[PDB]
Amino acid sequence: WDLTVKMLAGNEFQVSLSSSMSVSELKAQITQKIGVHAFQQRLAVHPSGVALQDRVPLASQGLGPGSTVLLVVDKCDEPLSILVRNNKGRSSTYEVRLTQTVAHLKQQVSGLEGVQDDLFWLTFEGKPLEDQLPLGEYGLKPLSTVFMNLR
Structure with missing residues (x-):
């Protein structure tokens, strides 16, 4: 499964989901690409902008091979x-x-x-x-x- 990630504040890159095809694995591949913690990632479907649901399978949210997701990193790490x-x-x-x-x-x-x-x-x-x-x-x-x- 090959996906396009478009970051709002920057780059577009490819990820491959070869295990679970879950949000958790998508987040982990993004970590390998840009070094950002899974819990700081916010993801939506391109181009609707509908937020990804963290426990629903990708297949049921309209996403699979060749789909595009939007990514933003939550900048907040205040105490x-x-x-x-x-x-x-x-x-x-x-x-x-x-x-x-x-x-x-x-x-x-x-x-x-x-x-x-x-x-x-x-x-x-x-x-x-x-x-x-x-x-x-x-x-x-x-x-x-x-x-x-x-x-």
Whole structure:
């Protein structure tokens, strides 16, 4: 599957989807082309401008081989205030950026809570956060609540 990507603020380039033919794989190929995090990519159908739905298959949104998608990169990486609730249900406020790793947040929580980093993990809406992934890949927002879970 070969697709044209047209960036509003710049270049047009080709990508190939040879695995899942999903939005997730389209975003990953764009990362290889322009070095931008998947969670910062905004995509629409060319030329309608209708936004891509992140869980609907590409085939059902009018897209396949030879289709064109519009791409813009969200320029926003300002700090945002989230909550992390400790083992006793006490929440503390943390300033994070979506380009920081889960490991960055775990360092902040480790210091404020006084719990060595390997004695806990973090969950958002029940899903575990992985140290190496950016906070942005979990859809954290201003006022998101994250849970500290002890071993």
